[PDB]
Amino acid sequence: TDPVRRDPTEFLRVLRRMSRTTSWQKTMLFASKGRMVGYRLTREHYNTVLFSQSLWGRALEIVRVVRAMQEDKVQPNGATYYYIVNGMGNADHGWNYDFRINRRLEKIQHWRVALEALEACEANGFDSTDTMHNSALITLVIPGFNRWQQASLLLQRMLREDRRMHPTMVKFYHDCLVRNNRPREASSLMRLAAERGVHGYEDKWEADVYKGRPLDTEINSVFRPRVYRQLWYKWQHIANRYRPTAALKRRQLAPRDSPTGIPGFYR
Amino acid sequence: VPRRIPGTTKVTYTNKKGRTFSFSVPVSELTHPQVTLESAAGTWREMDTSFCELGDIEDDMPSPVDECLRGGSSLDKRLIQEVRERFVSFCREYVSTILSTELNAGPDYEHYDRRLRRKRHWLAIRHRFEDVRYVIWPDVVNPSLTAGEMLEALLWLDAASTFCVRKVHPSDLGDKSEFLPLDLQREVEVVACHARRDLDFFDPSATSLEQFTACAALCVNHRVPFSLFFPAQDVCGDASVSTGQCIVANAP
């Protein structure tokens, strides 16, 4: 290898460019090979890799790179915790044709990883934004597995910390509650959302019916990170930003016998 | 005097056309020792990742038995019971064609669910049995585990041993003997002793009859006499009795 490509600053810049404009596989493979042969990887390199890993929302690669960082004895900053918790929250999950998209999540146990990442980020002295907590709660409650007690504890922590609630985690928690048959907790969540003013639950407010008693395949949906259909979103809004419910299709942005630009429309 | 984070070099390059490119490259951070930031909460704490199941075959499958037997007090009765019930659940959930490309590695990342899951489960079962058998089944010298739950655990272990993986791939890095059924002679003897210690072990009910049939099958398979499952007074006065004679004499 020529010295120009052997220079580690070129390694860092090409890795950053790869993370900006490629998939997770490119960055992971390139970083692993570089770490294997020379190219001493630093905290900046690890954060750049975790950026793409969180962007694509994958858990096994994130735990692999976390183990690699532990082996290399690199002290991470809050960006690493943010990236890993966001990747856990953006991990794909879907019940299609009585077949889950990811069967590895149950073995990976990404909820515990997200919880410990949030706890470590709080403990070591780094800022804790609303997105990390919302992603952790999303990991706790999904159609895959039922973890509602820990999610309720985290929601109480958010309530006493005056943190914002995201509609995605609100919807996931509400679905988990109604699936676990806890209408009391579902009603409490609805009241909280209505009071806050979340876009999805601004109007939805209901009275309290439990006024005299104290405390004590199923779902068919698919969830993937934004990056999977960001191109579709961009072209949809570029073509028709005045009719959002238009179902952007072929021949609207490319004539016959010509490529439409985006490979893999609708996956 | 206080530690200062290394700066990032800002370089502005003006292209011949006129497109200015600004870069922030940490050349100083690429070298020198990595500055360590001590956490506010005392010592630096990091998340552990010894519980996630991964496709790598260099380690064993992380099960709750691993975190239960990480150095706890083995004399705790409820801890022993929880370990036993977790092992029972593991065995219950436990109870393949040669591909050239997977010879020098494990099954591919996409085919983890169809080829490597059972192999990992069997390896985990064997490795946990080799460490738990002396806790679930104490050696013969009140007991920490009852005879019924010990029998249930032994039955699940026998089912796992009989349904162990039979096809040995060239990619199997361990010894080929690990793919063979287990030998539970001592465990069956311990179960028989614990069953004969307390009376009224066998009942004419359907569940107790099934348990008796399972015990007879265990004795026949593991070469353990069936006389040990009954008090010696019922067997005293006879030079020797066989398993078939014991079954035909004590069949309800």
Binding site: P3, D7, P8, R40 | -
Partner: peptide, 21 residues
Amino acid sequence: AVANLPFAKMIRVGMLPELKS
């Protein structure tokens, strides 16, 4: 000839290992 810049020397001394007896 890029390899003869002092930056290459810095990279070399960074890549230098530790020899412990």
